[PDB]
Design an enzyme around this catalytic site. Structure first.
Site, mmCIF file in Angstrom:
data_model
loop_
_atom_site.group_PDB
_atom_site.id
_atom_site.type_symbol
_atom_site.label_atom_id
_atom_site.label_comp_id
_atom_site.label_asym_id
_atom_site.label_seq_id
_atom_site.Cartn_x
_atom_site.Cartn_y
_atom_site.Cartn_z
ATOM 1 N N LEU B 38 0.824 -1.197 0.000
ATOM 2 C CA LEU B 38 0.000 0.000 0.000
ATOM 3 C C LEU B 38 0.866 1.258 0.000
ATOM 4 O O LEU B 38 2.085 1.214 0.176
ATOM 5 C CB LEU B 38 -0.936 0.003 1.210
ATOM 6 C CG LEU B 38 -2.253 -0.762 1.088
ATOM 7 C CD1 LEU B 38 -3.065 -0.612 2.363
ATOM 8 C CD2 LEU B 38 -3.043 -0.267 -0.111
ATOM 9 N N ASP B 39 0.211 2.393 -0.211
ATOM 10 C CA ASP B 39 0.843 3.699 -0.142
ATOM 11 C C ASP B 39 0.573 4.328 1.220
ATOM 12 O O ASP B 39 -0.363 3.950 1.929
ATOM 13 C CB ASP B 39 0.326 4.606 -1.265
ATOM 14 C CG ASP B 39 1.015 5.953 -1.296
ATOM 15 O OD1 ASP B 39 2.263 5.984 -1.310
ATOM 16 O OD2 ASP B 39 0.310 6.982 -1.306
#
Ligand SMILES: COC1=C(OC)C(=O)C(C/C=C(\C)CC/C=C(\C)CC/C=C(\C)CC/C=C(/C)CC/C=C(\C)CC/C=C(\C)CC/C=C(\C)CC/C=C(/C)CCC=C(C)C)=C(C)C1=O
Ligand SMILES: CCCCCCCCCCCCCCCCCCCC(=O)O[C@H](COC(=O)CCCCCCCCCCCCCC)COP(=O)(O)OCCN
Ligand SMILES: CCCCCCCCCCCC(=O)SCCNC(=O)CCNC(=O)[C@H](O)C(C)(C)COP(=O)(O)O
Ligand code: SF4
Ligand code: SF4
Ligand code: SF4
Lengths: 157, 83, 311, 165, 54, 65, 385, 112, 185
Positions: B38-39
């Protein structure tokens, strides 16, 4: 039509006479044309003498004098005030700024004429218009009101 | 205190709404930014969704500490406000 | 007995015409005071202006603000119209020219004046604008606070007469008018009537017939208070105190002349002075007029009792 | 302070003696001549320098004075003037289009004082309120009609300020 | 030209520019006596009228 | 129009009156319009417009010549 | 506490006023004025105009005091040009600036009194306002926006009877002021609605940038006509009124006294006005006579160049301030050497006064906010350019 | 309160970006009540809109530019929180949204 | 008291590292300082006995697109006690935040907001830095040289939409720019 052409004409004349004799404008003072409106209603020219008395709220006014520079931030409020007046209503544009932007026509924050926000019935030119010029504009509005035939047209439809 | 079943369901359900999170990988122990790739924006978005499904608030010093769904679900199970 | 509605119509319709022409007279007198002329184009001397105004407010195609119960909002102007006109059934214009000759007329007038607070209150709440609600509450409080002093001044007048019959209060001034001895009482009564009507320095403040009825009720109240001022202190229909050769003039003319004088005082006072503030209205009305009215009651009663000059 | 002063200032507080002095002034102004004017019948005083409706003048021979120099268009602070010019059949420098935006005009008189031939002037007329916006877009024909209609008064005024301009 | 707007020879007239006082009054002493005498005489006349009415 | 002097008559029939003032002026230069159908509020020719507005002292009959 | 909105669209209070008031009970705790409804981009439009073309913009800034802004702009241009102005032109400029000050003071006082509720003095004052606007309409062609004062000298000369008529006006303006003062000064209601309302200390006035009557009401004797005199103001005798308590009543009294002193200055200017020419003799910066342009080649060339390109100001920047009726009106003019100004900031006194409304009105009744607003004599033409 | 001092590195810029994003997220419920957005938009479509704006301005590497962007976004958020802007304005900006492009442009006008 | 005295006194008394440019003329005595010494300089000039500058007249920005530090911020100051005026100038580009002086002069808030609105210069420690003059939701800073005179958007009433709307600008008559510059200048 033996009496409709007569009775309808007379009742419509009565309606027009009342509307011309009692005009209650809502002065929308925005700039130096407000000074000219105040001078018009003062003792020298006596806008009251013709039956015109100014009103603070749009609920009770049948006319609306836009006199001053209309900016982009003020136009929504202008339209909101206009939408609050009862149906037989007229708008008078006073000065170059209200007519077509005037001396700030090429500005980034000026509405180039109040006729882009509300429908205008009479345009009074000047910068600022003379108080007698405003008297002439109100007289022209009165002349236009006398041209209305509300009851005859209602009868004809 | 809250039971593990309902908090596990509530953390396993909302995570599949990111249009990229694989439903097959989400589990009581699955880190947000590391295990799912994920970011950091999604790393704070999961915490925001934790307070989007309830009215409680997470202080700014309680969001960047541990990006693990196991500690997240433990903290959720230790949330008296929720039910 | 079917002629009683004729009397009621004959006292009501000319009252409305007089109210309209009183509005015209105010707008003309202020113009003359400020070195201009009032409405003059419409009529020969502007006398036709109120008719044009009436047809204008009638022919507006207005919309009803039904964002309320629509009952209390619609009836509040009706209620204040009720109260404003009902007080004219007892005011006498000459010897035997009164519609209803009550023996409790002074108290009936006090009751009618005290019941005028509800119309403005109901109008204030029924309008969803909170600010109008607060303004109506303030106006109601002002009317109340000065109605107290009006009642005390009524006591001052009633002590010297001994009867609540309005037509007997006038006959009690055959010797001299009560405005001569009780001149400070007359001044206080006039100022209280100014504050009662929400007028003059005491005037802190929707569409079509509701506002029309409120406006008509307020101006009818102005006329009624001028009539009361000339009825309790200026001798009513009684002629001038001296030189009794003009007695050919009917007594109803003298009452009218004195009422017009007091209306001119209303217009004059409102034109000549600025406005008071609310924190000063209450302070003034509770600290300058209540003690003075009570002291005048005490003084008049003590002086009349001492020399046995009582009725 | 003095008992006399206390009594004097307490009486004035109670007898409203500083309001009777204002009532007397207002009443004295009530019985006085009015200064309002019947506008349709009598007009307020003006000056020969008054800047009102624009007018394009012509020579007494019937030739228009405008020579299409565009010197008024370049001085107009409101950019209310648009001029198009070309060589006429006789070879004279004249305008084909001369239109003024009366909704942009600020009535400053810069164009009148910049014209080297006294072609564009602001006449004494100030009663020209219109019912439509594009009736305020004066063109060459409208301005020439204004000049022909107000020629005598414009000429008299220009004669008056010959001693000043 | 040589004829230019300006003051006439010798200048203009002198003009007042300060506030003018106005001592217009019935006086503090006179008003109290007038009102008190009116009250006393009027109360006496009210008593006489009440006697006649009785 | 009482105690007044008629200055001149216009081509449209309008009559122009004048009264002498001393210190405050008022009702000293006005017009009695020859029409009564709303009078159009603007019927004064150019020769009489200047006289009415006190721009010029010439009556308008003299302005023609 | 709740949040309140006063937008009066009717010009019974300014017209474009927008106050967002936070009221606890009947008191106001903060006043946040929302400005920008009359921001017409005047400052940016100046950069696109010639120095001559940008002069009428200053008429419409403070539209109750027209000559004051033109005087400041002309003085700034002369400072950047080192242009000498003839003595008669200076006397005319001072005379009309004082007429403008009287007009502004009359309008301010009576519009403030009408907001309080005194309807009568408004029309009494506008009669004299009409009388003075007649004098403006005579020298120029406009009653209000008269582009009369110009950078070189003045636009054009005075008509014949102007001095006589102004003298006749000054013969009675003193009595007019006396009647207006009699209506308001001694009245107990007027005292009660202004005394102790809007008190400002001298330190607060200095910190918030107050000027003019706002500053001088706090005891600060600071007049720009005596501290930094311009034109012929140092040859005229006039007093500077100074307040003692700083409330709204001192402001009103000082506004009366300033107008009396302006009458005095007008009388002196009429009596001492000399003869001569009304413009600088440098025709490279001022227009030629209409008889000379039609008879001389160089005069025609100068006329053409002035009315197309105008004059070019040498590259410099300066700040010039005059004593406008509202207060200190300043123009920060930047020139790059061309025929158009590079930058022209307009320092409006009403900006710094409307900024200080928050602290003057705090812990005051709602009905006192209108008096606090009216005592500052704010017009929004200058507040937001 | 006061405008924060200018950042010194990219880490501080990222921290301020996250703080502003969280502030905007907490501001979501208030907009749903000030404007009648209840039966208009899901409470996550707006969140995605702010995320998309941050992501498409995410190529900036200058801390000063990032701080200015955050300041402008905060000003816009404060304006939207107040009733200053009209209702359709936010709905006009904050909503998520065959031959050849060249030939359609050619049919439209000569000025591409 | 005068330009000849203030110049010498501030030359001697002021710390040298603050001011980097001093002009003494009749147009005005100016001081040019770095943006990180502005607050210190104004605090010194507000409290010193012989330079009691207690009035901040205004704050204005000037746009110089040809410079590296594009914007010039000018502080016009007034000393009532000594009847003198002092002008202090700094320079900043579009992405640097200069120190605010609202702490020293409370009136500086509105001019700083106007400078931010008109030029885009941000001020550190300003209690509320939001646009003061332009319309709500205005995009761009109008007083910049690259901003078009008429702007980018136009306002009109939309009857079907029943509200006043904003549209891209489209002039019925464009602004005519007249080039009067002379080659012999
Ligand atoms: C504040 O703004 C306003 C005004 O301007 C001041 C008004 O004038 C007014 C009202 C002015 C008016 C003339 C309305 C009054 C109209 C009437 C009382 C109608 C009365 C008609 C009759 C009694 C019928 C005629 C009877 C007879 C001829 C019988 C004769 C005995 C209002 C409501 C207002 O809001
Ligand atoms: C034929 C017709 C004649 C005319 C009839 C009508 C008369 C009225 C005409 C208009 C008069 C002016 C009306 C102005 C209206 C507003 C005036 C209100 C002002 C006011 O209330 O004054 C108060 C005090 O004065 C007061 O108290 C005022 C009331 C005083 C009543 C008089 C009492 C005197 C008693 C003397 C008795 C002696 C005789 C018996 C032995 C406040 O004033 P403030 O601000 O100072 O506050 C006092 C703190 N302390
Ligand atoms: C209704 C609400 C009104 C207000 C809504 C908001 C309106 C304005 C929206 C803001 C506009 C902006 O550009 S303000 C935000 C602009 N600032 C940046 O984009 C910083 C550069 N981006 C990065 O460093 C990374 O990509 C990062 C994305 C941080 C994550 O990635 P990592 O951590 O892996 O590194
Ligand atoms: S038309 Fe002229 S006087 Fe009227 S508001 Fe516009 S600029 Fe001011
Ligand atoms: S009067 Fe002024 S604004 Fe009007 S056209 Fe002439 S130069 Fe342009
Ligand atoms: S009106 Fe005069 S200035 Fe304008 S183009 Fe014609 S001749 Fe030239």
């Amino acid at each position: 039509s033996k009496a409709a052409e007569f009775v309808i004409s007379k009742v419509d004349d009565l309606m027009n006479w009342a509307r011309t004799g009692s005009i209650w404008p809502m002065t929308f003072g925005l700039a130096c044309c407000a000074v000219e409106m105040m001078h018009t209603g003062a003792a020298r020219y006596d806008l009251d003498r013709f039956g015109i008395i100014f009103r603070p709220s749009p609920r009770q006014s049948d006319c609306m004098i836009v006199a001053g520079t209309l900016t982009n931030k003020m136009a929504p409020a202008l339209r909101k005030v206009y939408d609050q007046m009862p149906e037989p209503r007229w708008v008078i544009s006073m000065g170059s700024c209200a007519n077509g932007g005037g001396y700030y026509h090429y500005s980034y924050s000026v509405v180039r004429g109040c006729d882009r926000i509300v429908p205008v019935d009479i345009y009074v030119p000047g910068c600022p218009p003379t108080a007698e010029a405003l008297l002439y504009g109100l007289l022209q509005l009165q002349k236009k009101i006398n041209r209305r035939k509300d009851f005859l047209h209602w009868w004809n439809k | 205190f809250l039971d593990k079943s309902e908090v596990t369901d509530r953390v396993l359900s909302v995570v599949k709404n990111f249009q990229k999170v694989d439903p097959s990988k989400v589990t009581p122990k699955a880190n947000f930014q590391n295990d799912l790739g994920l970011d950091s924006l999604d790393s704070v978005e999961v915490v925001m969704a934790l307070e989007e499904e309830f009215g409680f608030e997470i202080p700014d010093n309680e969001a960047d500490k541990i990006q693990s769904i196991d500690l997240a679900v433990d903290f959720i199970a230790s949330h008296p406000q929720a039910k | 007995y079917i002629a009683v509605p004729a009397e009621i119509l004959g006292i009501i319709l000319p009252l409305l015409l007089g109210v309209a022409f009183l509005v015209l007279a105010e707008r003309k007198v202020m113009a003359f005071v400020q070195r201009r002329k009032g409405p003059d184009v419409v009529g020969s001397f502007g006398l036709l202006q109120p008719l044009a105004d009436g047809l204008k407010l009638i022919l507006k195609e207005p919309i009803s603000p039904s964002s309320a119960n629509f009952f209390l909002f619609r009836m509040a102007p009706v209620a204040t119209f009720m109260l404003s006109l009902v007080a004219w059934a007892v005011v006498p214009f000459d010897y035997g020219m009164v519609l209803s000759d009550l023996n409790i007329g002074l108290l009936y007038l006090f009751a009618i004046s005290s019941l005028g607070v509800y119309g403005i209150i109901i109008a204030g709440r029924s309008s969803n604008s909170k600010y109008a609600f607060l303004g109506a509450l303030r106006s109601a409080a002002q009317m109340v606070s000065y109605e107290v002093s009006i009642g005390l001044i009524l006591i001052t007048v009633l002590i010297c007469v001994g009867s609540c019959n309005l037509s007997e209060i006038v006959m009690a001034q055959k010797q001299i008018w009560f405005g001569i001895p009780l001149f400070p009482v007359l001044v206080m009564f006039f100022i209280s009537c100014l504050a009662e009507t929400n007028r003059a320095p005491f005037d802190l403040p929707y569409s079509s017939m509701g506002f029309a009825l409120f406006f008509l009720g307020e101006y009818a109240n102005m006329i009624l208070m001028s009539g009361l001022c000339t009825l309790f202190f200026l001798g009513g229909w009684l002629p001038i105190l001296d030189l009794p050769i003009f007695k050919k003039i009917p007594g109803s003319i003298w009452f009218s002349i004195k009422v017009l004088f007091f209306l001119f005082l209303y217009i004059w006072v409102r034109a000549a002075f600025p406005r008071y503030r609310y924190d000063q209205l209450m302070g003034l009305g509770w600290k300058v007029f209540l003690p003075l009215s009570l002291a005048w009651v005490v003084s008049v009663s003590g002086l009349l009792v001492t020399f046995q000059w009582l009725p | 302070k003095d008992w006399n002063t206390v009594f004097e200032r307490s009486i004035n507080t109670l007898f409203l003696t500083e309001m009777v002095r204002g009532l007397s002034l207002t009443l004295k102004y009530f019985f006085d001549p009015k200064v309002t004017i019947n506008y349709p019948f009598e007009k307020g005083p003006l000056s020969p320098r008054f800047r009102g409706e624009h007018a394009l003048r012509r020579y007494p021979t019937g030739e228009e004075r405008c020579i299409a120099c565009k010197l008024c268009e370049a001085v107009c602070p409101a950019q209310a003037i648009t001029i198009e010019a070309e060589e006429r059949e006789d070879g004279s420098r004249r305008t084909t289009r001369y239109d003024i935006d009366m909704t942009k005009c600020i009535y400053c008189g810069f164009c009148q004082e910049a014209c080297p031939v006294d072609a564009i002037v602001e006449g004494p007329n100030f009663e020209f309120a219109t019912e439509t916006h594009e009736e305020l877009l004066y063109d060459k024909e409208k301005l020439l009609e204004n000049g022909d209609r107000w020629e005598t008064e414009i000429a008299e005024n220009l004669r008056s300020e010959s001693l000043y301009r | 030209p040589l004829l230019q707007d300006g003051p006439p020879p010798g200048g203009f007239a002198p003009v007042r520019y300060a506030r003018r006082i106005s001592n217009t009054g019935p006086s503090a002493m006179a008003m109290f006596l007038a009102v008190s005498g009116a009250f006393a005489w009027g109360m006496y006349q009210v008593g006489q009228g009440n006697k006649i009415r009785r | 129009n009482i105690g007044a002097t008629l200055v001149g008559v216009d081509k449209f029939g309008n009559k122009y009156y004048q009264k002498l003032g001393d210190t405050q002026y008022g009702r000293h230069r006005w017009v009695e319009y020859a029409s009564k159908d709303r009078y159009n509020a603007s019927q004064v020719p150019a020769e009489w417009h200047g006289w009415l507005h006190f721009i010029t002292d010439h009556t308008g009959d003299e302005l023609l010549s | 506490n709740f949040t309140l909105n006063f937008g009066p669209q009717h010009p019974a209070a300014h017209g474009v006023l927008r106050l967002v008031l936070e009221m606890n009970g009947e008191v106001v705790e903060r006043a946040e004025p929302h400005i920008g409804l009359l921001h017409r981009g005047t400052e940016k439009l100046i950069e696109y105009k010639t120095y001559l073309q940008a002069l009428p913009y200053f008429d419409r800034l403070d539209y109750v005091s027209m000559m004051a802004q033109e005087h400041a702009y002309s003085l700034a241009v002369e400072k950047l040009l080192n242009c000498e102005v003839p003595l008669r032109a200076q006397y005319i400029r001072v005379l009309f600036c004082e007429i403008t000050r009287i007009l502004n003071h009359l309008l301010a006082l009576t519009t403030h009194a009408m907001d309080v509720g005194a309807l009568t003095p408004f029309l009494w004052a506008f009669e004299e306002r009409e009388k003075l606007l007649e004098f403006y309409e005579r020298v120029s062609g406009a009653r209000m926006h008269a582009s009369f004062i110009r950078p070189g000298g003045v636009a054009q000369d005075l008509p014949l009877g102007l001095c006589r008529d102004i003298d006749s006006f000054t013969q009675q303006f003193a009595s007019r002021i006396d009647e207006l003062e009699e209506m308001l000064t001694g009245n107990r209601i007027w005292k009660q609605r202004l005394v102790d309302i809007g008190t400002v200390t001298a330190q607060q006035a200095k910190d918030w940038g107050f000027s003019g009557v706002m500053l001088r009401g706090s005891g600060v004797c600071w007049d720009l006509r005596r501290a930094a005199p311009y034109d012929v103001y140092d040859q005229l005798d006039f007093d500077v009124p100074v307040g003692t308590r700083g409330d709204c009543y001192d402001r009103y009294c000082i506004r009366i006294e300033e107008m009396r002193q302006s009458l005095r200055i007008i009388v002196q200017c009429l009596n001492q006005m000399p003869s001569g020419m009304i413009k600088a003799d440098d025709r490279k910066l001022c227009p030629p006579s209409r008889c000379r342009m039609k008879l001389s080649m160089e005069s025609l060339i100068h006329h053409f160049e002035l009315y197309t390109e105008g004059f070019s100001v040498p590259a410099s920047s300066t700040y010039t301030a005059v004593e406008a009726p509202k207060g200190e009106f300043g123009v920060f003019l930047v020139s790059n050497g061309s025929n158009r100004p590079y930058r022209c900031k307009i320092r409006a006194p009403g900006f710094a006064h409307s900024q200080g409304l928050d602290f003057m009105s705090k812990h005051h009744m709602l009905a006192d906010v209108v008096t606090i607003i009216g005592t500052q004599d704010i017009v929004f033409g200058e507040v937001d350019r | 309160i006061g405008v924060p001092p200018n950042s010194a590195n990219l880490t501080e810029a990222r921290r301020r970006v996250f703080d502003f994003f969280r502030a905007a997220c907490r501001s979501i419920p208030t907009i749903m009540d000030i404007y009648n957005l209840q039966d208009v938009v899901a409470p996550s479509q707006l969140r995605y809109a702010i995320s998309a704006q941050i992501r498409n301005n995410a190529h900036i590497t200058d801390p000063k530019v990032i701080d200015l962007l955050i300041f402008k976004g905060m000003e816009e958020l404060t304006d939207i929180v107040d009733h200053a802007k009209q209702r359709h304005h936010i709905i006009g900006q904050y909503v998520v949204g065959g031959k050849t492009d060249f030939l359609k442009n050619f049919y439209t006008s000569n000025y591409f | 008291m005068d330009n000849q005295f203030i110049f010498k006194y501030s030359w001697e008394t002021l710390p040298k590292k603050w001011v980097k440019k001093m002009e003494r003329s009749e147009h005005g005595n100016r001081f040019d300082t770095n943006t990180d010494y502005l607050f210190q300089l104004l605090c010194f000039l507000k409290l010193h006995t012989y330079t009691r500058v207690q009035v901040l007249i205004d704050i204005c920005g000037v746009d110089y697109p040809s410079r590296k530090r594009r914007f010039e911020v000018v502080y016009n100051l007034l000393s009532t006690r000594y009847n003198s005026r002092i002008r202090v100038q700094t320079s900043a580009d579009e992405v640097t935040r200069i120190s605010s002086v609202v702490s020293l002069f409370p009136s500086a808030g509105w001019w700083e907001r106007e400078v931010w609105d008109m030029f885009g210069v941000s001020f550190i420690n300003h209690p509320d830095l939001r646009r003061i003059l332009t319309d709500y939701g205005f995009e761009g800073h109008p007083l910049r040289k690259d901003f078009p005179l008429s702007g980018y958007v136009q306002v009109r009433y939309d009857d079907p939409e029943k509200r006043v709307v904003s549209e891209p600008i489209e002039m019925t008559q464009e602004f005519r720019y007249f080039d009067f510059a002379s080659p012999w200048e």
